[PDB]
Amino acid sequence: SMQEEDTFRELRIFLRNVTHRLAIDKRFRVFTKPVDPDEVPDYVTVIKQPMDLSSVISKIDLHKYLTVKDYLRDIDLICSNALEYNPDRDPGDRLIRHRACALRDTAYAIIKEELDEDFEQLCEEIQESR
Ligand SMILES: CC(=O)c1nc(NC(=O)[C@@H](C)NC(=N)N)sc1-c1cc(O)cc(O)c1
Numbered sequence: 001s002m003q004e005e006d007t008f009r010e011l012r013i014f015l016r017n018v019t020h021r022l023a024i025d026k027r028f029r030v031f032t033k034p035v036d037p038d039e040v041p042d043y044v045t046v047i048k049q050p051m052d053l054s055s056v057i058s059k060i061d062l063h064k065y066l067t068v069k070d071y072l073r074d075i076d077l078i079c080s081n082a083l084e085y086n087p088d089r090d091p092g093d094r095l096i097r098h099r100a101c102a103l104r105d106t107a108y109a110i111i112k113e114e115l116d117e118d119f120e121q122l123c124e125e126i127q128e129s130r
Contacts, residue, residue: 004126008066010121011123015060015071018110023053028050028103030096031078046085051077066122077102 021034032053036045043050051074065071082100086093 007119007122007126008063008107010119011040011065011068012060012063014115015065016057016069017124018114019060020054021110022107023033023057025106027099028053029069030099031082031103040085043085048083049081051081066130067123068115069124072107072111075104075107 033046034052034055035050037044039082039095056071056074056078059074060071065074079100082096086096086100
């Protein structure tokens with residue numbers, strides 16, 4: 001209805017702002033754009049479901065997230081992909097892993113502080129009605 005697409009539009013506006021705040025953080029620069037296979041050719045073999053912050057923005061604008069849980073699933077995917085592609089003990093791998101866990105922790109912490117629990121519950125109940 002009108003009340004419901006208004007609820008989803010408010011979610012989209014909130015998720016855009018959060019994603020922008022993540023994307024401007026210097027720690028998360030490596031997660032801002034899709035991987036260039038020219039630059040890591042073995043990535044395509046390893047990472048079956050690639051995800052990055054520009055693609056998250058695109059999915060927001062495409063109405064793909066109806067709940068914050070849908071959004072955090074793709075943040076979780078950015079993180080798990082980074083851990084999967086960078087599993088080794090060497091410092092380059094460890095640096096990316098640390099940034100990936102920090103991206104995840106930061107996104108969850110913003111949403112805990114700033115997204116009203118009743119608003120998320122509303123989003124979920126509309127979603128389950130469709
Ligand atoms: C996002 C990601 O997982 C990622 N991981 C890297 N790891 C490595 O370069 C080394 C340390 N490990 C290894 N090759 N196994 S570089 C990198 C990355 C991807 C981009 O699209 C842009 C960018 O600046 C960096």
